[PDB]
Ligand binder design. Structure first.
Ligand code: NA
Ligand code: NA
Ligand code: NA
Ligand code: NA
Ligand code: NA
Ligand code: NA
Ligand code: NA
Ligand code: NA
Ligand code: NA
Ligand code: NA
Ligand code: NA
Length: 133
């Protein structure tokens, strides 16, 4: 296994970094996002009191560009979150991706559509989400 940060939601509802041991992978950014999905492989290794963040059955493609941007393009299930978790989800995805050496910012898509706003509640989002946010 390899130590990775997963930005999970704790017993008090906060998005908090947790270090988990993930199997070795040739697509580590995608893998880390797969370990944020409710009901996915993180389920067996969640630390006490923590939960996963992305809706069940969400899948994703991560395309890492030469400028440091990771384009994370989610399946339609990604729309199935609770409104009030909208910004926590953006933060979790952003912080989880930007741990990697080749990613310093994030752009979100759903079903290959570019996102100006998150779908459930309309939170505006830029194409250069980063830890500065
Ligand atoms: Na905590
Ligand atoms: Na809270
Ligand atoms: Na890994
Ligand atoms: Na592997
Ligand atoms: Na693996
Ligand atoms: Na990789
Ligand atoms: Na907790
Ligand atoms: Na779910
Ligand atoms: Na890069
Ligand atoms: Na509401
Ligand atoms: Na980085």
């Amino acid at each position: 296994t390899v130590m990775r940060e997963l930005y999970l939601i704790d017993k008090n509802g906060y998005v908090v970094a947790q270090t988990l041991p993930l199997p070795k992978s040739e697509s580590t950014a995608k893998q880390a996002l797969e370990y944020l999905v409710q009901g996915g492989p993180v389920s067996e290794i969640l630390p006490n009191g923590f939960r996963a963040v992305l809706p069940a059955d969400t899948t994703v493609n991560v395309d890492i560009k030469k400028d440091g941007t990771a384009i994370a393009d989610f399946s339609n299930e990604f729309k199935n979150y609770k409104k009030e978790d909208e910004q926590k989800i953006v933060q979790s995805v952003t912080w989880t991706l930007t741990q990697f050496s080749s990613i310093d910012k994030v752009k979100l898509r759903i079903n290959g559509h570019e996102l100006k706003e998150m779908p459930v509640g309309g939170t505006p989002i830029s194409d250069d989400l980063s830890r500065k946010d």
